[PDB]
Amino acid sequence: STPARRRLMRDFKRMKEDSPPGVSASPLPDNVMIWNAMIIGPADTPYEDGTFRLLLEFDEEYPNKPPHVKFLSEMFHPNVYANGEICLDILQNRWTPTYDVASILTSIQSLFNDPNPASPANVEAATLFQDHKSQYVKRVKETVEKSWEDDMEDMA
Amino acid sequence: ELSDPSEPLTQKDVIAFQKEALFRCLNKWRVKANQLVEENEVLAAGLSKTTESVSGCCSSIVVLARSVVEDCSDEQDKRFLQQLINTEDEHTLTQIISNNSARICELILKTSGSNISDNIGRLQELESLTLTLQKLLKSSENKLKKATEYYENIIAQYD
Amino acid sequence: PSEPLTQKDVIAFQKEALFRCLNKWRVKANQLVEENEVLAAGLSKTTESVSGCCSSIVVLARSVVEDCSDEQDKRFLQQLINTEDEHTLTQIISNNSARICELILKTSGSNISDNIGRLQELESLTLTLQKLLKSSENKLKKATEYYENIIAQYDRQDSESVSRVFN
């Protein structure tokens, strides 16, 4: 009933009524401060048809504080660190309270479309995106097939 | 077959999308691989026809050698021509002839009483390249036809 | 069967079997690239050695055709010399090696061809055939990529799951 927990429940109604294309998310049946989220890779990106699962961590300062958001799937992306945490400007310093679950995920989903250089989380990924696009795509195509094996039990 | 387009995706929908996504990735390699099988048939066939086709060129050169060793002046050249006649292996023979075709032609022209044209070593070099680039051109054109025909029947199946 | 023939058939297969089918084709495809690279190399090396053996007979023809007695024989040797098709040469050489050998040994002549003029023609042809090869090879790469890109779109067009997710 606290201001954070009430605002989050609205985001769940948002995801339930009009879920953005290629995205789903839901809180834990026993804890609304943790959400299981999953982003499907958009078309014409090397992350195409990839089913990548995420984990969202909130505190009582939401929506005034950006949630701590990190990936659970193996990811090869210049912006995604090795621990799952993401170098997304919206999350770090561009936080605007008008962002809900739906927008946070499509923003990350859109990092697959056109990534952001000079934010080197995976130097391997950042450099290979500039020097050997084939080897970059080969490594991403691997993270896409490995994403498909989960069976998405976090969605029921 | 499960949807509900307005309702958020379900575990049953993502598995049904992961399965279909597997097929799309699968069919990409299946198609890419089956065309590479098609190319290997194209390559293997050309390998056998090319090897088979040289038997006319090789045997006719052995004929010219035999008629010339008897009237050769140099003993180094008589030995080399006897090596040609006594090799009895077309793959080895063909390499002996192609590597020494300049020398071989000169020996036949000198002994049989013809004027060895000057600039004749470059004449053979440019003749073998012209013939090779012609065969390589035609092969890549058949590779295009056979690949086009391969993919076209696949697209035909979809419609 | 053991393989999903159609996309409609994929519902019946488990993930583990699908992964197995995916990796088998990936491997067969990656192995055939290695094989085709090796074979294509061997085809040209074999082609070079066969063109070297035959061209030496064309050389012997050119040095003697100028001094031939019969018009029946000059026509036959000019056809031999001017056939830019190695497959045709091999049949001309193999079918008529008796006549060709007799003509080189008997009708022995002089050096009066344009020794420098034909070298120049062959230099322009070699350079031309080199450009045409490179162009025809890119046409293959662009066609493989083109058809593969087209076939890939059909799978997403006919995918009910993509239609559900991104409607």
Residue numbers in the entry:
A (entry chain A): 2 to 157
B (entry chain C): 12 to 170
C (entry chain D): 16 to 182
Tell me, in the authors' exact words, what the paper reports:
The mono-ubiquitination of the histone protein H2B (H2Bub1) is a highly conserved histone post-translational modification that plays critical roles in many fundamental processes. In the budding yeast, the H2Bub1 reaction is catalyzed by the E3 enzyme Bre1 together with the E2 enzyme Rad6. In addition to the RING domain, Bre1 contains a N-terminal Rad6-binding domain (RBD) that also makes important contributions to the H2Bub1 catalysis.
We screened through several fungal species and were able to crystallize the Kluyveromyces lactis Rad6 (KlRad6) in complex with the Kluyveromyces lactis Bre1 (KlBre1) N-terminal fragment 1-206 or 1-184 (crystal forms 1 and 2, respectively). The structures were refined to resolutions of 3.2 and 3.05 Å. Our structure indicates that KlRad6 interacts with the N-terminal region of KlBre1 RBD polypeptide 1 and N- and C-terminal regions of KlBre1 RBD polypeptide 2, which come together to form a single Rad6-binding site at one end of the RBD. It interacts with the back side of KlRad6 opposite from its active site, composed of strands β1–β3, the C-terminus of α4 and neighboring loops. The interface buries 2000 Å2 of surface area and contains hydrophobic, salt bridge and hydrogen bonding interactions. The temperature factors of these regions are also elevated in this structure, but less significantly.
